[PDB]
Write an enzyme that holds these catalytic residues in place. Structure first.
Site: not given
Length: 155
Positions: A10-11, A48, A70, A124, A134
């Site tokens: 995550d980023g 990311e 994601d 989500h 995240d």
């Protein structure tokens, strides 16, 4: 003992450029490593890509990796661009170097040593390991200790 290396990335970035971070989770051997750092000025796309790079480079032998992100930025480049980026020598239609070429090449070098299976989750509807990601990404951005060199308002 897991037969497959599992990576979660995550980023995050508060601006463009603004302080940013990344969080990556690696399930390697029988351990669970956690990477995380923030950079003073950068972009969400560089954070990311950094996530994945830093994780794949912790691997010291040829593996069978499964990566979960994601990130649409990574998805798009892995799914519709990168293939074309190699063949053309990493250039755009106007003959300039692609955006973030520094990281795409760095990542291309790391992806190269492994059997890679990509898992594109929806921001989500992913695993809790994507959420912990995240979360770290966020905390990092709130306290930068590094500098993102290859960043350019430019090229």
């Amino acid at each position: 003992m897991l037969k497959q290396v599992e990576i979660f990335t995550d980023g995050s970035c508060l601006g463009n450029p603004g302080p940013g971070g990344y969080g990556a989770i690696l399930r390697y051997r029988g351990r669970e490593k956690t990477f995380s750092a923030g950079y003073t000025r950068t972009t969400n796309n560089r954070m990311e890509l950094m996530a994945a790079i830093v994780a794949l480079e912790a691997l010291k032998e040829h593996c069978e990796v499964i990566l979960s992100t994601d990130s649409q930025y990574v998805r798009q480049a892995i799914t519709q661009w990168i293939h074309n980026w190699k063949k053309r020598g990493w250039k755009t239609a106007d003959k300039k170097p692609v955006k973030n070429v520094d990281l795409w090449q760095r990542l291309d070098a790391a992806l190269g040593q492994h059997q890679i299976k990509w898992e594109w989750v929806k921001g989500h509807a992913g695993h809790p390991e994507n959420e912990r990601c995240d979360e770290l990404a966020r905390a990092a951005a709130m306290n930068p200790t590094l500098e993102d060199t290859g960043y350019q308002v430019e090229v």
